[PDB]
Design a protein around this ligand. Structure first.
Ligand SMILES: [Mg+2]
Ligand SMILES: [Mg+2]
Ligand SMILES: [Mg+2]
Ligand SMILES: [Mg+2]
Ligand SMILES: [Mg+2]
Ligand SMILES: [Mg+2]
Ligand SMILES: [Mg+2]
Ligand SMILES: [Mg+2]
Ligand SMILES: [Mg+2]
Ligand SMILES: [Mg+2]
Ligand SMILES: [Mg+2]
Ligand SMILES: [Mg+2]
Ligand SMILES: [Mg+2]
Ligand SMILES: [Mg+2]
Ligand SMILES: [Mg+2]
Ligand SMILES: [Mg+2]
Ligand SMILES: [Mg+2]
Ligand SMILES: [Mg+2]
Ligand SMILES: [Mg+2]
Ligand SMILES: [Mg+2]
Ligand SMILES: [Mg+2]
Lengths: 83, 97, 206, 60, 23, 116, 127, 155
RNA sequence: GGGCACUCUAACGGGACUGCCCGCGAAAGCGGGAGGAAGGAGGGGACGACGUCUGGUCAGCAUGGCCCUUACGGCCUGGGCGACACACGUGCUACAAUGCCCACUACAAAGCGAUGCCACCCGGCAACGGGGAGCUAAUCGCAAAAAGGUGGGCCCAGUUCGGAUUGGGGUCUGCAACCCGACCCCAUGAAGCCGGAAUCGCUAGUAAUCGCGGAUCAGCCAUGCCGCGGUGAAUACGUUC
């Protein structure tokens, strides 16, 4: 996985948004295209309407899911099965 | 005293590798016979057909024959006359000491 | 859907290449384009002249171009004008010590491509397909030749049904390397389709 | 959709990964070659045409 | 073997070297 | 269960015989044998009561094992299956997790094919 | 004061020099059977000299290079009887019939295209 | 084939007993073209057989094959609406081919663990007259005689 | 030191012509011998007949015309081509002892290599990292080949067989490995005991089996493809099917 010599890479733009609400006043319903961008410990609480090719899935983050990426809570596939 | 010859047409490459042996010898004084540096074959394999048909190809190779030459007993009468050389086209040459 | 190309099948055996020069792993992909590019412009401007084959030699910052055309007068122009106006727009794009000769064609009809080109005109002149195809061969065989062939495939006679019709005369063996079979396909653009125009010429065996 | 691609390709990429090989002549996406700057198709074409220096068919 | 990793041949198989194929 | 949390077979070499212990593998074999200085060629049966505990003891307080070892990787997954990340759905269905193939193959998390 | 011969076998080549020795064998340094530690087809290459009795009547300095052993040992064999002629031009008989004074071009077949190998082909589902 | 009579490959006699027959057997032993391996398990089995039988095992397996040489097998001939197990005087080349294909076949059958062990043990029995190696032959030669009603259909 | 003997290399040539003997022959040729490294096309290669399948390919290019014209064009972020109760094709590994492991010891080729090939040193169990010499490359590097051998272990178990699966822990590349990269280490070790009907390949350095290079290429999901050599069989009565 992503190097450690190479720090946790966030889009930086997705990143200003969050810290802009962390002290100035959270929270609002952002609609990120950022999936690469790891979840981060200034983002919990927020309602990052992450995108997935077609729409923005709201996913309120918590102290039980961050080390992953935003591409890991907005599914790209919808599969109720076969038959 | 190194002189290197390089080209694709071995025939032309050779024909060159002779004059520079004929020449420097006359003016002198000592020259080391040509040595055919083995060939770096750059082959390329492409399917004949312009679409599928994996099973019918056609090879096309590239032959970079190479010839190295020297001048033991050098002499500038050799050198001077050397810069006056009508060496063919398909050939690159290098000279070292 | 089979026959192997006769020129690549006689390179260094029966017929030597055109662009003559050796480049390293670094300039040779570039040289190719600069040479291909040249054959582009010439094939457009010399087209009227009757271009047959453009040899290219390189060396050091320079590059030698040979042009074999049966009618050198056109490409040259007054006192070399047309031929002299080509040594400027020439290096304009290529940009490097560039020469440009113009060899004299003993007989053009002994030039397969230069033969097929003509016919390709005629057909676009609405002539008789089956006619000239035979016409050319007689002209070739009268041209001291001992082997000639001309092939035409496509919507013949305007017809919706495609079709291949071709003629020959004398010896034209296609598995004989010791046998200079000149080659050359000229193409015809037509309101009603396109016509591939193939033509082979046995000039002799050494 | 083509000539926009053949153009876009040549222009300098935003990132180097996005710089991507083509056939300057024909413009075939795949089976292209850096050594020549061509496609596999043209490769066999100018090859038989001999307009490919030093390179000939193979046989052994 | 050839498929296994924690082994010389399995790594020889897949052209890598590690704790069981030392350079 | 002469061995912490399980009875290892006998007439076989200690080093190897430990692998019949959840979370005890080759890489961990020599370690304790090295740490317990117990020659791996001697058979467990042939072991010494003192060796047994030394090879028992040290093995018992440097890693997790068996029960508490299955106890971890479950929650590690159940959480996933709670947060519902992609590896969660791949477990929430019983599907491949490491980008594996799904049109075919993967017949290990699908088990024998089920008729249609 | 020396007898040298050359023998090849596949990609393998050998330069065999026969010398009036007890029967020792120097093949690229170490001893014959040392450089052949456990190869049954070993004592084969030595069969020529055995065809004319000369097993013990000589030592030989031996190089070998190209391909593997099986090609080498055979190539060895080749150059020795190759030599016996230069020490008995009448020794053709007693080798030629045996065939040891003969090289074979039983060489490889180039992997041919559309074939997995030079002959093996990919199976198919006809219908 | 359809042209003429194929040729018989004459092999290079072994390097221990000077026999082509031996050279033939190792082949059947030789898997994946591992002659050194094959050559071992043989001359290895040649050792165990020596220890338990102090007669030159060269002769042993010189014998245990003739005992394996089948004289008559059956071959199916489907003349008209039926196929007939028409038996035929087996051929020499083939008989060696037949004997050379069950000893190993019956050796590989054998339950003992090491290669040279089995291969040898099949060597002995045939020298006596025991083992599935003799079984095939035995069964083969009599089904034929159990079908002696089709010799007129011979070829 | 020197030396072209030799190995090797790459250009030019010799060489097999059924040309000599016996033989059945009308001739053409067939059998066999000797001589020759090699014999009756030397082994293979590239070489594809007028032609067939209204064969494939407007998605490489060309081009007939018809259709699209703030769109059926163009750039961009995300996302699919990697989905998944199933039904085939082509492979990888296997199910073991003529085997698996650990260590130790030799033997190729054709290739590739300048923000390339990476020596040697050092960090780390490692992938790898960091230093650093050398090579416009018959020098120098990738680089070790593996099967093999010499020793020791494994004693017939779903095992020291298999490495699927999953957790955990990182590298490296890349702006970015979430769907979606591979390399390294740990622990887990699933199915599988030679596979029904049916079916494939190969005739000699072939099949079998070991491994190695290169093109495509930032990395590459490659067990592929094209090539490269190593070791090395069985069998062909016959032509009914
Ligand atoms: Mg903040
Ligand atoms: Mg009109
Ligand atoms: Mg294992
Ligand atoms: Mg365990
Ligand atoms: Mg060679
Ligand atoms: Mg091979
Ligand atoms: Mg004959
Ligand atoms: Mg176009
Ligand atoms: Mg077009
Ligand atoms: Mg159109
Ligand atoms: Mg886009
Ligand atoms: Mg996408
Ligand atoms: Mg696809
Ligand atoms: Mg199925
Ligand atoms: Mg399949
Ligand atoms: Mg297990
Ligand atoms: Mg299981
Ligand atoms: Mg089961
Ligand atoms: Mg065949
Ligand atoms: Mg590469
Ligand atoms: Mg590979």
């Amino acid at each position: 996985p992503r190097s450690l010599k190479k720090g946790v890479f966030v889009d930086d733009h997705l990143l200003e948004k969050v810290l802009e609400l962390n002290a100035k006043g959270e929270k609002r319903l952002i609609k990120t295209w950022s999936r690469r961008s790891t979840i981060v410990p200034e983002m919990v609480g927020h309602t990052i309407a992450v995108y997935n090719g077609k729409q923005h899935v709201p996913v309120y983050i918590t102290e039980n899911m961050v080390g992953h990426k935003l591409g890991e809570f907005a599914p790209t596939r919808t599969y109720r099965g076969h038959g | 005293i190194r002189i290197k010859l390089r080209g694709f047409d071995h025939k032309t490459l050779d024909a060159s590798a002779q004059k520079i042996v004929e020449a420097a010898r006359r003016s002198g004084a000592q020259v080391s016979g040509p040595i055919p540096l083995p060939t770096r074959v750059r082959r390329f394999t492409v399917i004949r057909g312009p679409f599928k048909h994996k099973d019918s190809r056609e090879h096309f190779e590239l032959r970079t024959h190479n010839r190295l030459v020297d001048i033991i007993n050098p002499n500038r009468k050799t050198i001077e006359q050397l810069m006056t050389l009508d060496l063919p086209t398909g050939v690159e040459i290098e000279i070292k000491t | 859907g089979n026959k192997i190309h006769p020129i690549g099948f006689r390179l260094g055996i029966t017929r030597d290449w055109e662009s003559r020069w050796y480049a390293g792993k670094k300039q040779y992909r570039h040289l190719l384009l600069e040479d291909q590019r040249i054959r582009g412009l010439l094939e457009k401007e010399l087209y009227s002249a009757g271009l047959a084959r453009v040899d290219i030699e390189r060396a050091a910052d320079n590059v030698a171009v040979t042009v074999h055309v049966a009618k050198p007068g056109v490409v040259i122009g007054r006192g070399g004008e047309r031929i002299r106006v080509l040594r400027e727009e020439l290096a304009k794009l290529t940009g490097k010590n560039v020469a440009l000769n113009v060899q004299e064609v003993q007989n053009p009809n002994l030039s397969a491509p230069l033969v097929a080109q003509r016919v390709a005109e005629q057909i676009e002149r609405r002539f008789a397909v089956r006619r000239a195809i035979k016409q050319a061969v007689q002209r070739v065989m009268e041209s001291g030749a001992k082997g000639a062939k001309v092939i035409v495939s496509g919507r013949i006679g305007g017809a919706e049904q495609a079709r291949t019709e071709w003629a020959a005369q004398g010896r034209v063996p296609l598995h004989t390397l010791r046998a200079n079979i000149d080659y050359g396909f000229a193409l015809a653009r037509t309101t009603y389709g396109v016509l591939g125009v193939k033509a082979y010429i046995f000039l002799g065996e050494v | 959709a083509r000539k926009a691609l053949i153009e876009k390709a040549k222009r300098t990429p935003k990132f180097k990964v996005r710089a991507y090989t083509r056939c300057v002549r024909c413009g075939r996406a795949r089976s292209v070659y850096r050594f020549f700057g061509l496609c596999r198709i043209c490769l066999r074409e100018l090859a038989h045409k001999g307009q490919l220096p030093g390179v000939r068919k193979a046989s052994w | 073997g050839k498929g296994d990793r924690r082994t010389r041949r399995g790594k020889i198989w897949r052209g890598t070297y590690g704790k069981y194929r030392p350079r | 269960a002469r061995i912490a949390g399980v009875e290892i077979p006998r007439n076989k070499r200690v080093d190897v015989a430990l692998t019949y212990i959840y979370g005890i593998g080759k890489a961990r074999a020599k370690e304790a044998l090295e740490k317990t200085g117990i020659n791996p060629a001697t058979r467990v049966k042939d072991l010494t009561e003192a060796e047994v505990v030394r090879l028992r003891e040290y093995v018992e307080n440097t890693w997790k094992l068996e029960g508490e070892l299955r106890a971890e990787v479950a929650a590690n997954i159940k959480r996933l299956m709670d947060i519902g990340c992609y590896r969660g759905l791949r477990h929430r269905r019983g599907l491949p997790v490491r980008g594996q193939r799904t049109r075919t193959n993967a017949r290990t998390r699908k088990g024998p094919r089920k008729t249609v | 004061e020396q007898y040298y011969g050359t023998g090849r076998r596949k990609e393998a080549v050998a330069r065999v020099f026969l010398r009036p020795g007890n029967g020792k064998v120097t093949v690229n340094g170490q001893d014959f059977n040392e450089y052949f530690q456990g190869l049954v087809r070993a004592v084969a290459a030595l069969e020529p000299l055995r065809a004319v009795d000369a097993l013990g009547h000589f030592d030989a300095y031996i190089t070998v290079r190209g391909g593997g052993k099986s090609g080498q040992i055979d190539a060895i064999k080749l150059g020795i009887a190759r030599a016996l002629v230069q020490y008995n031009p009448d020794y053709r008989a007693k080798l030629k019939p045996l065939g040891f004074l003969t090289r074979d071009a039983r060489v490889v077949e180039r992997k041919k295209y559309g074939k997995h190998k030079a002959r093996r082909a990919p199976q198919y589902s006809k219908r | 084939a359809r042209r003429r009579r194929a040729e018989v490959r004459q092999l290079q006699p072994d390097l221990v007993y000077g026999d082509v027959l031996v050279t033939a057997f190792i082949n059947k032993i030789m898997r994946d073209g591992k002659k050194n391996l094959a050559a071992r398990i043989f001359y290895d089995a040649c050792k165990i057989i020596q220890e338990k039988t102090g007669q030159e095992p060269l002769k042993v397996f010189k014998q245990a094959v003739e005992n394996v040489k089948p004289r008559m097998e059956v071959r199916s001939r489907r003349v008209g609406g039926a196929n007939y197990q028409v038996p035929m005087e087996v051929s020499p080349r083939r008989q060696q081919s037949l004997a050379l294909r069950w000893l190993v076949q019956a050796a590989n059958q054998r339950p003992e663990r090491r290669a040279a062990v089995r291969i040898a043990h099949e060597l002995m029995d045939a020298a006596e007259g025991k083992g599935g190696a003799v079984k095939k032959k035995e069964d083969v030669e009599r089904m034929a005689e159990a079908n002696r009603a089709y010799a007129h259909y011979r070829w």
